[model samples]
Target: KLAALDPIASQFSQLRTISKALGFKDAADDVTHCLFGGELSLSNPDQQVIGLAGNPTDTSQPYSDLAFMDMKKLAQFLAGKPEHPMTRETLNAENIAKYAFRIVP
Candidate 1:
C-alpha cells in the first residue's frame, strides 16, 4: 500500500524502505486511513499499530506522527552499553520493544 502512494512514500522514502524491509508495508494504508480520524486494530489483546488525532503533512486531518524502530542499530547500541544483553546475532524486533525516529535527504 505504501508503495502505491508515490507522493507520501517519496516524502518518506526512508520510512517506506525500512517498513518494507520489516514486513510492515501494510502499515502504509493504516497510516493513511488514520488521517480520516479514528483508531485501528490489527490483532487481539487490544493493540493498535496506528491511530489518528492529527497530521504532520496536512493540518486538516488528525495529528499523528510516524516512528521507525531500527532494531539492528538499536541492538548494536545496546550491545555497546554496559550491562546490556543484546548482541548483533540476537538483534531483532522480538528482542527489542515489541511496540516501539526519522531523517531527511
Candidate 2:
C-alpha cells in the first residue's frame, strides 16, 4: 500500500473501489495509513488521516497529507513479485485508467 501513495493518492477513492471490485476487499481499509500517514487515529483505531499541508516535491518540506509512492514503480514491483495476489492482467491499464485523474490543488 505504501508503494501506491504517490500517483494513486489523488485517485485513492477510485483505486479503493477498483481494488475491491477486483477481489481486494481490504484495499480500502488498507488505505488507512495512506490517508492518515503517521498520525493519531482516535475514531477508527485501524484507520488514519494525515494533515495535507506540505510541499510534496521538496523532500526538505517537513510534513504532508500523503505518503508518496511512484505508481509506475509500484506496478513494476507487483509484476516482479509472484506472490502478489493481484496482477496487471487482473487490473490492467484499461481497467485502472478509469480511476486515473490529474490531482488538482
Candidate 3:
C-alpha cells in the first residue's frame, strides 16, 4: 500500500496518535512535520530535536539531534490552539507543566 511508505500518510497517522493521546491536535501536526520532514522516503532521517536554550523555530540554528527543546515555547504552542480536541477543558499552565515532559511515541 502506498499509504505504508508515504510520508504524508505516515505523518497523518502519527499525528493522529499524538492528537488522540493528548488532544493537542495543532501541536501534533507541528511536531510530526518537524520529525518527518517534508520529503517522501528518508534514507537517513535522524532524530531531529531542538535544544532547551533555543526555540525550534529559530533561524540559522537548526535541530538535527535529540536536543531538549524549549519547554515554555512548546507549552505555549500547544495552548495557543483554541481548537484543541482534548479541551472539553482548555490547556493551561497547570496542565502543561504537569504533563509537559511526558510525551511518548
Candidate 1 has which clashing residue pairs, if any?
A: 53-62, 53-63, 54-62, 54-63, 54-64, 55-62, 55-63
Give the per-residue lDDT digits (tens) of candidate 1, residues 53-85: 111233222222343323233333444552223
The per-prediction tally of clashing pairs is 7, 5, 0
Give each model a TM-score. 0.19, 0.24, 0.22
lDDT of 2 by residue, 1-105 (tens): 354543323333433211111111123243323321332232433332222222222322222223222344334444554221222234323333332322211
lDDT of 3 by residue, 1-105 (tens): 353342211222121111123222224123433222331111213221222221122222222222233333343444455222223344343332222232233
C-alpha local distance difference test of each model: 0.27, 0.29, 0.27
Q: Stretches of candidate 3 above 4 Å error? A: 1-73, 82-89, 102-105
Q: Enumerate residue pairs that collide in model 3.
A: none
User: Model 1 clash tally?
Assistant: 7
lDDT accuracy of residue 19 in candidate 3:
13
Q: Please say which candidate is ahead in TM-score: 2 or 3.
A: 2
**Candidate 1 segments whose C-alpha is farther than 4 A from its true place:** 1-66, 82-95, 101-105
User: Which pairs clash (backbone N, Cα, C closer than 3 Å) in model 2?
Assistant: 6-69, 36-48, 36-49, 36-50, 52-65
